[PDB]
Design a protein around this ligand. Structure first.
Ligand SMILES: Cc1sc2ncnc(N(C)C)c2c1C
Ligand SMILES: Cc1sc2ncnc(N(C)C)c2c1C
Ligand SMILES: Cc1sc2ncnc(N(C)C)c2c1C
Ligand SMILES: Cc1sc2ncnc(N(C)C)c2c1C
Ligand SMILES: Cc1sc2ncnc(N(C)C)c2c1C
Length: 279
C-alpha cells in the first residue's frame, strides 16, 4: 500500500498487535555463539538480547574481542549504524575503545541513566569539565568540553584521547532526555527535531565511521531512530516515495540485530514519525 492510508486502516481495524506479530514470525534467526560464551556473561545486560556473530563489532584485542554491539549496513540508503546496549560498569572502557577504533563522530543516547527507579546504564561520560575520566583497561581519557541543555535534548562536546599515541578526537554526544518511562511520545515532533540535529552535525555522514546508537538494550528506541532515518532517506532518493515499505525496511535491519522495535506501540510510533517527517 501507501504508508499514511495503511496507517489509518490499521488504526480503524485495531490490528497493530497482529502486524507486529507477523514481523516477529518473519524476522531472521542467525547464531550468536560468541555472546553466549561463559567468559562474556558480565558483558551482556540482558540474556535474551545478543549480537549475531556475522554482524558483531570486534574490539581490536587478542584476549577478548567481545562487545554487545552490531553493524547495521543499509546498502540502498548508503547509511551504516552501530547499535549497542547501554554500557555496564565493566564495559565502559570497551564502549569508548569501540568509538575510537570505528572512527565514529557521534554517540546517540535515547535513555536516562535512571528510569522507573532502576539503573538503565552506567554514568559513562564526565559531568564536569575539571573532572575527566580515565579508562585504565583500554588506555583512554575522556574530557567534557562543553554542554548545551535544551527542553527535549542535550548536546555535549567531548575530547577522547588515546593515551598510547597521544592522538585526540572530538566526539559529539546527542542525548534525547524526554522519552517517557512508559509507552512512546504522543507526538513525534521533538524526536524528528532531534534526528535532524544529529544529521546537521555530520555524525551520520560517510566522511566518518558509523554513528553509535544506544538505549538500555539497544533494540527498541534505538531501532526506532535508525528505522525512521533510513525510511526518510529512501523517500528522498527514489522516483516514487510511496514505494518505501516500512515493514520491509525493518525486516532488512533485523538481518543485522535481533528484536529491533520491541512493541506494537513502538511500531505505530515509527510509522507516525516517517509520515510526519515526509511532510
Ligand atoms: C587495525 C586492526 S583490525 C583488527 N582486528 C582484530 N584484532 C586487531 N588487533 C587486536 C591487533 C585488529 C587491528 C589492530
Ligand atoms: C556555542 C557553541 S560553539 C560549539 N562547537 C562545538 N560544540 C558545541 N556544543 C554542542 C557544546 C558548541 C556550542 C554550544
Ligand atoms: C556555524 C555552525 S557549524 C555547526 N555544526 C553543527 N550544528 C550547527 N548548528 C546550527 C547548531 C552549526 C553552526 C551554527
Ligand atoms: C561549531 C559547532 S559544532 C555543533 N554541534 C552541535 N551544536 C552546536 N551548537 C550550535 C550549539 C555546534 C556548533 C556551534
Ligand atoms: C522533519 C524535519 S525538521 C528539519 N529541519 C531542517 N531541515 C529539514 N529538512 C527538510 C532536511 C527538516 C525536516 C525534514
Amino acid at each position: 500500500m501507501e504508508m499514511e492510508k495503511e496507517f489509518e486502516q490499521i488504526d480503524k481495524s485495531g490490528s497493530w498487535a497482529a502486524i507486529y506479530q507477523d514481523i516477529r514470525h518473519e524476522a531472521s534467526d542467525f547464531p550468536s555463539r560468541v555472546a553466549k560464551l561463559p567468559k562474556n556473561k558480565n558483558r551482556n545486560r540482558y540474556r535474551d538480547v545478543s549480537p549475531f556473530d556475522h554482524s558483531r563489532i570486534k574490539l581490536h584485542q587478542e584476549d577478548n574481542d567481545y562487545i554487545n554491539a552490531s553493524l547495521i549496513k543499509m546498502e540502498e540508503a548508503q547509511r551504516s549504524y552501530i547499535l549497542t546496549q547501554g554500557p555496564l560498569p565493566n564495559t565502559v572502557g570497551h564502549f569508548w575503545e569501540m568509538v575510537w577504533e570505528q572512527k565514529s563522530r557521534g554517540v546517540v543516547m535515547l535513555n536516562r541513566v535512571m528510569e522507573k527507579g532502576s539503573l538503565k546504564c552506567a554514568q559513562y561520560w564526565p559531568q564536569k569539565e575539571e573532572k575527566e575520566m580515565i579508562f585504565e583497561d583500554t588506555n583512554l581519557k575522556l574530557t567534557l568540553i562543553s554542554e548545551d541543555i535544551k527542553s527535549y535534548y542535550t548536546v555535549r562536546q567531548l575530547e577522547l584521547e588515546n593515551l598510547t599515541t597521544q592522538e585526540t578526537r572530538e566526539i559529539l554526544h546527542f542525548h534525547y532526555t524526554t522519552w517517557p518511562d512508559f509507552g512512546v511520545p504522543e507526538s513525534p515532533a521533538s524526536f524528528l527535531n532531534f534526528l535532524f540535529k544529529v544529521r546537521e552535525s555530520g555524525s551520520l555522514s560517510p566522511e566518518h565511521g558509523p554513528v553509535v546508537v544506544h538505549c538500555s538494550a539497544g533494540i527498541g528506541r534505538s531501532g526506532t531512530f535508525c528505522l525512521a532515518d533510513t525510511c526518510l532517506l529512501l523517500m528522498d532518493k527514489r522516483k516514487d516515495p510511496s514505494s518505501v515499505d516500512i515493514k520491509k525496511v525493518l525486516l532488512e535491519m533485523r538481518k543485522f540485530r535481533m528484536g529491533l522495535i520491541q512493541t506494537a506501540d513502538q511500531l505505530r510510533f515509527s510509522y507516525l514519525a516517517v509520515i510526519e517527517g515526509a511532510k
